[PDB]
Ligand binder design. Structure first.
Ligand code: SF4
Ligand SMILES: [Ca+2]
Lengths: 289, 522, 286
């Protein structure tokens, strides 16, 4: 009855925001949700609690002993729409696997059963940059079932969406993990919405929704709140709600069909993003050629 | 060799030179064993703090557990009912160990059967093993009731105990009014205590679910008492005794105190006393229902409060001075019977004892383990005595419990260095006793080894084991002991202080060395 | 004489490029240098070796059996001015610590003894987005000593830097992996440059240089080559050549004094980068 979703994607592209607003809109509908930050940056809840930076498990844990030294009381907080959120905790510089900090945060929640609790949804905000075994954690332990990738028109951003798909498959066979779809964050690029859907198909999935770039958003952030708790009547507001509906009834939980760096390139250059390689001028000075 | 006059058994037979030189060849010759010096290396390693860290990181491996499966408790529970025959619907090999296990702990005959399901049933369940089974059993050991439980197999292939039972009645394998309560008991869920919970619940239903109409809380002026998974006869008794001494009308639900101590008079009884069925049927009419070992009777409290509509109190297992008070009181409150001078005195005496020998118990570090209620009650009591329960382990416990305990620990100066662990096993505890060494271990026989180990490292490192719990095999008749109530408190208090003094003697028995502190009067 | 370096930085600011161009200067300046690509994208040698994408030890070992199947020319390839370039190799997508593939890579460069061969410098291009065990490996094993951080005048770019410092602070009490300053890549931000040195010292080191942004780079790269080789006459080529020496000469190899998150919230509003913190504005809003 409780669906476990996780949002993956490259960093610095409003992913955490979209996610949080998604949950926000998801809250209005009446769905009890829970977010679990797995982004080393630790900032996946700020927009719900208004706080500048929630206390990560790994922090309070090193201020008590091991782990079960503390209690969900000061680790799990209820913000707007009664949403419950906890941030895993950034790995210790130089020493420590980010993934590690995640499991321990999950298992902890498992132990004090922060799950069994009428939750309809639980979103694991996960950074999907260098898709390693660390960040793949929530999928390996099989705690995440529905995967929604966040990206936009950009090589690296898409290059991530791809490698993440690769990852999903690596387990999708011996597991139930699936790729619900893609979410494109408007980066005000021409034919951006087109480029993603195209790519989605190559993977065998679909672009669940296209989040435009309204500025009412940057207003809420500054306010530390979500587009919803800020202006429940803005345009961008009903935009996310559209994503909420879509997710609630998605059916495309599939196993992506990864593509080659070349297949990928082919698209970019084709949508006007990437250039076209001039195999000849390669290694030619402004003098000889 | 043997001197017909003074025969030597396994030990010290093999200490004879020939046997010595015998095994020596076998070793060097074909064992290809690691040079001693290595074994000594590796060993020493395990007694370190480093090994601990590595040890506590275990996830998939479990070494020397401290819990058993559900059925084991379903069986025991079922034994508490008049002419009831524990029936475990599943592979027969299981029942084997069950009886076999209890026998070693009670040194009494454990009667229990199995509908011997096999491979040929891993596809079409055992809707037949049930049919024939129930019939065979009923006609052979002619019980008044048959309680059904399940084994690992049974649940994995998933069989509907209810259905199967309903058909065995329909198809005419056993009368239709023949009591056959049931409960699913998956090995892979909770410990043995959970079995009991289930089982009991399963019986409660069978006699009160389809007939709550003519029932009216308080109509009988009695209090129901559910002992839970108890293995110390003396307990069942002390409860009955205290209540009867209080003039309280009670109905002990699930009383195996008789079949577990049938006398040796020339004839074998497979059944003896126990909770009558009528007692169960009527239970609902009881003023209230008290749970002796709540921490593992939630599925019962639910049903009891939910159906019978009783206001089950928030009581702790009655162990130690404090809690037992609370128990007696709450009992009074309910029954309306004053606490008799008799008990007021027993108590006073328990206190006398405490004062009489605190000096020795004070500041004594213990490492212990067992079941939830038991463990926490033991912890509570040690605190009332001024000891420091440093390693409270409990393999089958949960988080909610761990908290309640920490709460108990935090409320006492003597709980500063206390740590509670759940999910951990005896191999973990093994380390906790090497690194952060206590003075004794309070637990079951499985702990006899941990001791051996502590000694292998050295006399000054050995940690004497104090048998209190379950199961116990290297000692006799301890199952007649008592841990509940004031009677219990006293026993434990003695088993303790004396265990301590027992050892202090051993440490100062050295002639002209340490025998100076070998005082006569202590 | 062989100073094993490391260039860390938030992926997406020029690190990879500025790193190629930094060395592109040394070899041309008569310096034997080997670039070890530790970035997961695997584009730490493309500009040197004039290649579209060099083969990582993984795409080969994983191919031809294992590691004991590869040679030296296979991965290690001397591009511009005799510069041996190797790519650590990304992690097996969804599995394996990306930093585990680097150990296996640096260790293998010692199996074919590719260091002892007349070389002046070693350059590790490690990704410093999240300083986890993976990317922190080259430092842990003391395989690098000179740590120069790439960090533009941008929120995250600078944060990563601060954190990389902390990565050093950890292995500093056992290894010789010291600091080396910052390398700010222009982005047209007012005071962006000082903003950097304003922080370099806050750590205990300096801003070894301020690389500007000339189209000659976006043109030199288009031609899978460095700005050095392209047009040594263009002033931008000087920016690179200048720093080149600054590095060699650089004597300051300290131990960072990692500031706090708030110390950064401060240093960034001091330069108008980060918006000033309001107050009653937060919370509830109609
Ligand atoms: S799995 Fe990823 S985050 Fe975890 S240690 Fe390896 S590289 Fe660092
Ligand atoms: Ca006997």
């Amino acid at each position: 009855a409780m669906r476990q979703c996780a949002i993956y994607g490259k960093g610095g592209i409003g992913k955490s925001t979209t996610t949080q607003n998604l949950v926000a809109a998801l809250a209005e509908m009446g769905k009890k949700v829970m977010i679990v930050g797995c982004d080393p940056k630790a900032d996946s809840t700020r927009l719900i609690l208004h706080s500048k930076a929630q206390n990560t498990i790994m922090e309070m844990a090193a201020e008590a002993g091991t782990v079960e030294d503390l209690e969900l009381e000061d680790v799990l907080k209820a913000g707007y729409g009664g949403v419950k959120c906890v941030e895993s905790g950034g790995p210790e510089p130089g020493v420590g696997c980010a993934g590690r900090g995640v499991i321990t945060a999950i298992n902890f929640l498992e132990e004090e059963g922060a799950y069994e609790d009428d939750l309809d949804f639980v979103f694991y905000d996960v950074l999907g940059d260098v898709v390693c075994g660390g960040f793949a954690m929530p999928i390996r332990e099989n705690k995440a079932q529905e995967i929604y990738i966040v990206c936009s028109g950009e090589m690296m951003a898409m290059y991530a969406a791809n490698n993440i798909s690769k990852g999903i498959v690596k387990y999708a066979n011996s597991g139930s993990v699936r790729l619900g779809g893609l979410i494109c964050n408007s980066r005000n690029t021409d034919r951006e919405d087109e480029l993603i859907i195209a790519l989605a198909n190559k993977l065998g999935t679909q672009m669940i929704h296209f989040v435009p770039r309204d500025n009412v958003v940057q207003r809420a952030e500054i306010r530390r709140m979500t587009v919803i708790e800020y202006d429940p009547k803005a345009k961008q507001a009903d935009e996310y709600r559209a994503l909420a509906r879509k997710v609630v009834d998605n059916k495309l939980l599939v196993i992506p069909n990864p593509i080659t760096m070349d297949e990928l390139e082919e698209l970019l250059m084709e949508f006007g993003i990437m250039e076209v390689e001039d195999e000849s001028i390669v290694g030619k000075t402004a003098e000889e050629v | 060799s043997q001197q017909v006059d003074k025969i030597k058994a396994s030990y010290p037979l093999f200490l004879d030179q020939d046997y010595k030189d015998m095994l020596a060849k076998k070793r060097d010759g074909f064992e290809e064993k690691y040079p001693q010096d290595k074994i000594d290396e590796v060993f020493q390693w395990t007694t370190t703090k480093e090994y601990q860290e590595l040890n506590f990181q275990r996830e998939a491996l479990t070494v020397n557990p401290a819990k058993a499966c559900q059925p084991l408790g379903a069986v025991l529970c079922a034994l508490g009912f008049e002419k009831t025959m524990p029936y475990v619907h599943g592979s027969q090999g299981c029942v084997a160990y069950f009886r076999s296990y209890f026998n070693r702990h009670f040194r009494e005959p454990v009667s229990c059967v199995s509908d011997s399901m096999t491979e040929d049933a891993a596809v079409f369940g055992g809707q037949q093993n049930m049919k024939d089974g129930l019939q065979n059993c009923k006609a052979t050991y002619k019980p008044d009731m048959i309680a059904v439980s399940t084994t690992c197999m049974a649940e994995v292939i998933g069989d509907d105990l209810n259905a199967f039972i309903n058909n065995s009645k329909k198809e005419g394998f056993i009368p239709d009014e023949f009591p056959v309560p049931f409960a699913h008991t998956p090995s892979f869920v909770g410990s043995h205590v959970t079995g009991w919970d289930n089982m009991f619940e399963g019986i409660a239903r069978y006699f009160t679910l389809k007939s709550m109409d003519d029932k009216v809380v308080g109509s009988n002026k009695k209090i129901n008492i559910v002992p839970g998974f108890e293995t110390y006869l003396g307990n069942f008794r002390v409860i009955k005794r205290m209540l009867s001494e209080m003039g309280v009308g009670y109905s002990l639900l699930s009383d195996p105190e008789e079949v577990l101590d049938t006398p040796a008079d020339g004839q074998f009884r497979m059944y003896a006393g126990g909770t009558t069925q009528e007692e169960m049927k009527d239970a609902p009419n009881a003023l209230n229902t008290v749970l002796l070992q709540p921490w593992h009777l939630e599925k019962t409290k639910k049903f009891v409060e939910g159906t019978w509509k009783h206001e089950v109190p928030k009581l702790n297992i009655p162990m130690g001075l404090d809690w037992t008070d609370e128990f007696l009181m709450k009992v009074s409150e309910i029954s309306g019977q004053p606490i008799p001078a008799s008990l007021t005195k027993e108590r006073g005496r328990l206190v006398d004892m405490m004062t009489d020998s605190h000096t020795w118990l004070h500041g004594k570090r213990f490492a212990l383990w067992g079941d939830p209620d038991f463990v926490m009650g033991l912890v509570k009591f040690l605190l009332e005595l001024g000891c420091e329960p440093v390693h409270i382990l409990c393999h089958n416990g949960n988080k909610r419990w761990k908290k309640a305990v920490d709460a108990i620990l935090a409320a006492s100066p003597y709980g500063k260095n206390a740590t509670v662990y759940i999910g951990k096993d005896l191999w973990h505890l093994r380390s906790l006793v090497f690194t952060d060494k206590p003075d004794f271990m309070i637990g079951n026989s499985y702990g006899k080894f941990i001791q051996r180990d502590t000694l292998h490292k050295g006399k000054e490192f050995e940690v004497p084991l104090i048998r209190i719990g379950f199961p116990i095999f290297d000692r006799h008749h301890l199952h007649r002991s008592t841990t509940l109530g004031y009677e219990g408190a006293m026993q434990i208090l003695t088993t303790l202080v004396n265990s301590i003094l027992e050892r202090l003697d051993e440490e100062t028995r050295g002639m002209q060395a340490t025998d100076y502190n070998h005082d006569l009067v202590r």
